[PDB]
Amino acid sequence: VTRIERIGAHSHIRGLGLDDALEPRQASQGMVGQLAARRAAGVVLEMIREGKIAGRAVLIAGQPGTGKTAIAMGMAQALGPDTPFTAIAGSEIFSLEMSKTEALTQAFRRSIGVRIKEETEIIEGEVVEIQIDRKVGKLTLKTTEMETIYDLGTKMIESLTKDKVQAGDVITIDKATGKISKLGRSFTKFVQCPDGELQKRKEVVHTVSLHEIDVINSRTQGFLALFSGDTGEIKSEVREQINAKVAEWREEGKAEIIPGVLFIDEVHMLDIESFSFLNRALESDMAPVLIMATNRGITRIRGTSYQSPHGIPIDLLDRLLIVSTTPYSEKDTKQILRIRCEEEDVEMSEDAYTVLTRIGLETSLRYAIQLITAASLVCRKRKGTEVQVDDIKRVYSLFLDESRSTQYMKEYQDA
Amino acid sequence: RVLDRAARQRRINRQLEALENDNFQDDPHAGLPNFQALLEEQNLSVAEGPNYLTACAGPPSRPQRPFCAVCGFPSPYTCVSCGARYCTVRCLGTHQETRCLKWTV
Amino acid sequence: RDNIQGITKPAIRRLARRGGVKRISGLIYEETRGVLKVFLENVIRDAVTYTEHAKRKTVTAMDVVYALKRQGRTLYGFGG
DNA sequence: ACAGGATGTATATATGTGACACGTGCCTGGAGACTAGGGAGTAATCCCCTTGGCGGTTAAAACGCGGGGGACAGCGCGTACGTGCGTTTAAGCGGTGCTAGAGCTGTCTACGACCAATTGAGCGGCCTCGGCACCGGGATTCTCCAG
DNA sequence: CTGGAGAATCCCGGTGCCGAGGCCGCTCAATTGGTCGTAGACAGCTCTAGCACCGCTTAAACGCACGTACGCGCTGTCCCCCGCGTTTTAACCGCCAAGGGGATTACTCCCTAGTCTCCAGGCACGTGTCACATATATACATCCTGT
């Protein structure tokens, strides 16, 4: 019923609502207004899909809450799967097991995919009989269209003796390695037998990132990325030769790289040492086209008393493109609230919509989006069906906001 | 059901024998109307040492090719009835309808 | 539950003997069990339908008689 | 060797069936107002059972084993059935060309249907006690070596 | 091909157990007597098939000839059911609480359904065309012939 993923803060966003010529619609695919910044997002998405001019940075500026993250989520959705879209917060680089610069270059590598094609042959049928003559034997597999015998060699007999697989089990046998996998006991876990041919060649493609390759080629069974046991790979010894070997895979017909996308949220958390590394990491061939956002203006840079836009030094500020987002009006706010209500199961009245739009233009946009569900549930408390203005007023009274909670501080608390 | 291994070996032997029947492979009628004996002349008193008995090559080192019995293509499968290999489901059907526990070729 | 084995080998052997058989194969019992199970399932489904229609909780013998009559197996001795 | 007529032949055009879609009229549904009777809906009776856990005891299964005698395949071989073929038999595809004989319409009774009586089957409730069902032999009669 | 056993039947007479039969006593359901609309039967009338041909065409049934392939018998031997004796086990008990679960009967009552109207619209029937099949001009198109 309820999956691990539920209705979050960016579920309505299904992608960029652009036309064939990168012209944003008034409201489409869950994106309201934001024409200029949305079309700029479209341009960057197109030049990413192109994947020729690498090493480009963009900064989505604007007032707090002006869909700066919505644009990034829409770009991610439009880019679709099969293309790495790495999203991390500016605070995630501050790690104790690895240095901030190492974490940053690690995220960079994670934001670059490598496309490799395989031509393995996979078997898929059901076991009829398994034999063992203490050693050699025979194996009879069955599918809905045919049955056949198989000579159980050393590897096969050993693997099938180690595994508990027996007669009457739909299984798969990768003739390359011999990995046995049972998808269900029998006819009705139980599951029916497969159809078509028993042994058939299957093409497999893996979009492994340079990070995965490095972790695979660093230690004995070095695939410890699952828990990031590694504190940092050996730069220029196991990290530069992997690049040369990937270039060898390319321009030969072995593999092709897939330019990913990086989205560092709240970049103002990055210190001066992280910005210094970006000034040179974005000048290499294998560098993704990253985007970033910051709600602060000319604030202090973490590390010194210097004041600079976005809290980012000038040396990096003159190295990226800024994308400012304008404030929303009544129309845009109301349409965003309506799309948010459509995402959920709530259905507000027209007067309720106007009241919520006024409340969201008074204090802030996110406050109305939050009060949506509160009023929806308060309506269900009085045994109603539609969220009326009275419910929104009751909620506005119950739940306070930033600006109204700050003004209520006429009683001194701790400090 | 399933056939035994004696039947398959007899089929193989009889097919190899037909592969050397030169007069007429299926129906040697073609009209009925110093007379030495057959190969029995020496096959009845097979000698030892260098001779057609010891002159045999023997089993090869290269494993047998798994080739289909119907179309002559690679056959990763093997029919349960007589062991005759087949390539695809179409091959298995064309076999079962032409060769099975009831028929040989 | 799985009490279909209640119809044991000697029971099937006697049923066959009554039918003129004097020699039975080994694989006959598992087939006779399935055939009898299907025949039952059908007759009992018909009888349970007849019973549910009558708003009764007990499957009367006349309901079984009617269920058999539907399958053409008219059984005399129980009411019709 | 050629220039033109004398035959073919697919090609394109106007004419034959069928089957769907349309268009009238006349029966069959629909609509409505009464009048039971049927069935729903509790409320009582009589069954005769109800379940868990567990101890006991006897035969019906359940199992072991030998082994025999059948279930299978191979061999062979001799009909015998399909495979062409030349013949000829008779279906059948259109016709003509009557007449039974469906199918109908009308008319008008005997023939059902209630129906309120009347009452004698027939149905249940007991009682009784021959008649099957089982014991106990005692012959007989198959089955199985065993010669 | 008998013996020679050896179980299995199976006569045949015996004896209580309990279903089969009978008798009694009411209840109900078939009979009686009489009235009342239909059912359908029967007497026409129509016209649709059904039958009966006949001819021309030719598919087809058919006989024959002629192998090959399949059928039947034979054989060998080799697995897997039969016969029968032992251990296992489930199927009968019996036990020991204390009461209901559910077909069965019955009585109001009341919605639902028959009956019986009058209509009018929707579905059998007649007619209008249009898609596929058919048969025929025709503009070249390939041998034949003067030349």
Ligand SMILES: Nc1ncnc2c1ncn2[C@@H]1O[C@H](COP(=O)(O)OP(=O)(O)O)[C@@H](O)[C@H]1O
């Ligand atoms: N174009 C848009 N379409 C739909 N919803 C939007 C759009 N822009 C902003 N929003 C909504 O407004 C909210 C703004 O918050 P957010 O963009 O997350 O702030 P920030 O970008 O500063 O972190 C989001 O929760 C989002 O649902």
